Amino acid sequence: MAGEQKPSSNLLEQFILLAKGTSGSALTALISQVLEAPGVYVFGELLELANVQELAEGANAAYLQLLNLFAYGTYPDYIANKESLPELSTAQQNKLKHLTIVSLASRMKCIPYSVLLKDLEMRNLRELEDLIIEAVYTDIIQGKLDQRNQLLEVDFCIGRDIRKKDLSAIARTLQEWCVGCEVVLSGIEEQVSRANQHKEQQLGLKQQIESEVAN
Template identity: 60%
Template sequence: MLTEKVSLGSSNSPVEQFVLLAKSAKGAGACELIKQALEAQGVYVFGELLEMPHITELENTEHSKYLNLLKLFAYGTYREYLAQKADLPELTPVQQKKLKHLTLVTMATEKKCIPYTDLLLELDIKNVRDLEDLIIEAIYADIIHGKLDQKDSQLEVDFAIGRDIRFEDIGTIVDTLQQWCDSCETVLSCIETQINRANTDKSKSLKHKEVIEQEVANIKKTLKSQTQDVDEAMATDTQSGSSVQVDKTKKTVKGSRLRGSGSKFWQKS
């Protein structure tokens, strides 16, 4: 019979050493091993232990209730334990708290916002203070992540660890995953359509931009040519006007000299 507590040491998987010990533990020793595994800190999955031959051999024996208890911790909830309590071993305080933590995990995988009323019922807790203490313990144990919304009296879940899976649930899981894959394919197809449409619009926009830039360049070229013609015309008119002015000036000067000369010629002595 196994009487010493199992030390988890530095094992990568918290349940690994229990699995190793289950290779040699039989009968009452296997029952003791199960009780220790259910109380062990950090052990929240039990599938590997359930697959061990000496554990499965407990079926239909005087120790079968411990095998059923192990299955309850692997797949069930605290409410289910209360319903089957007469046929199962009495839980220790540590086991009771762990099963409630696992019940929290199950509820967290079904809803992202869990009302306190549902939690109080499923966990068989009488007041909100004790409920919030249990939730905080589960968060510190790193089996769920979330926050307490005391205003709306609910638990908002961000993350929850996975639990063991019953063999009969595998078909449902496969169907769910297939639906998820189909949804991903639909979303991917929609995204590809949007990308193609965006690329087409971008191509049209670039061509339109090129046409506009070419038109602007042509207009600038035309305006530049017209400006040059106007400048040349203005330069020609300016040169012609200056020549006439000079001629007029010369004539005026010449006329003044003649009048001056005449005045001097007829002056009396």
Template identity: 55%
Template sequence: MNPMSMDRDEPSSLLSLSNHSLEQFVLLAKGAKGFACAELIKQVLEAPGVHVFGELLEVPNIKELETGAYATHFRTLNLFAYGTYKDYLENKSEFLELTPVQCKKLQHLTIATLATQEKCIPYSVLLKELDIKNVRDLEDLIIEAIYADIIHGKLDQECKRVEVDVALGRDARLEDATGIADVLADWCNACEAVLNSVDRHIQRANHHKQRAIRHQQVIDQEIVYIKKTLKTQAENDEGGAGGSESHSAPKKSSGKGKTPRSSKFWQKTT
């Protein structure tokens, strides 16, 4: 079976769409306190189109929830910003009990995280990381993630994997900055190496081109010389043939029927 294509029109920025949806919650959080902020967190975790939460985590009123009665709400918001569904399953007591909508959103975000690690994700890995029991439910979840603009790609049902073209960028912790900078530095170095290789190939191609041009010029000159030589030779041959015909000597007569002059000296006189 051929891969099932689920490509969609490439967005200008997956992240910008999520940021735009988050703005209203950031504005509300700036004027809320305590319980109101905790309820706001529950709402944002279920809100469609909101898949990044870093800006909300930076709001002072939200930061105040890190300790106290609503610390669980704060940890759950951190989970959606940086964590995966597997983190939730392994530490359920640390977080709020998620609704089905929130579970699905966290599973979608987990797919986005896995897509940053490898572009072809086997079904076996996804089944384990998302705690899904059968392939049909997994494929439905992946298709939902594609239509939610979490990832863009296609299902390869024959090879049992999802091939990701582009994925939503998730929030990054401050301590991740060094690793991100290293990745970008490696990418820049790789680009520089490719550019240098391209330059060398261009120089080599130009060198071969110049040699080919010079060789062609030599051949063209030889062709011109040969043509001139053949033309001159042909003209000389034509001129020599005409001159020999005009200056040829007349043929001598054979002299048949004539008596030799010397014979009269041998005649007898009477």
């Protein structure tokens, strides 16, 4: 319905009315069709509904585990936690791989190939760059293949998930970088209050000299 970065736009009121009316096993079908929603793998204001709250910790408490994984966890969590979460499709298993990998490139300028080969259990180059190119092909990833650094060049990242609260840390990292660019630019400001204020003083005095040269 609404439109910015998100999965298939049906999903919001889709699963609103689903969890509203589909519950228990109908809630499980709800979840199964939730599973393919990439940009909303996390449902903060969608777990706002008590229907998803019983989705959570109901029969599908493992699915709330998986949801928080999208919010918090990674696919390599599943590589360890192969049984904790609900079932997933190979497409959706690679989707959780893309969870952790978009989080990684979110971390670094460029994540190494071997990094995701190992944490995401990726064996070889072929499948590696297959899922890589499909991630970038989602257009989440800007930049390019950082082969020489054995990384992935990253120029732009679309938001992966709703990623239950880093909210505090989120806003405070925001405050951090805001103030950082601010202080860079403010040091510039006072270098300006130096230089061409210094230009005012310098030329004023130099002109005083030139005027006094006469008599």
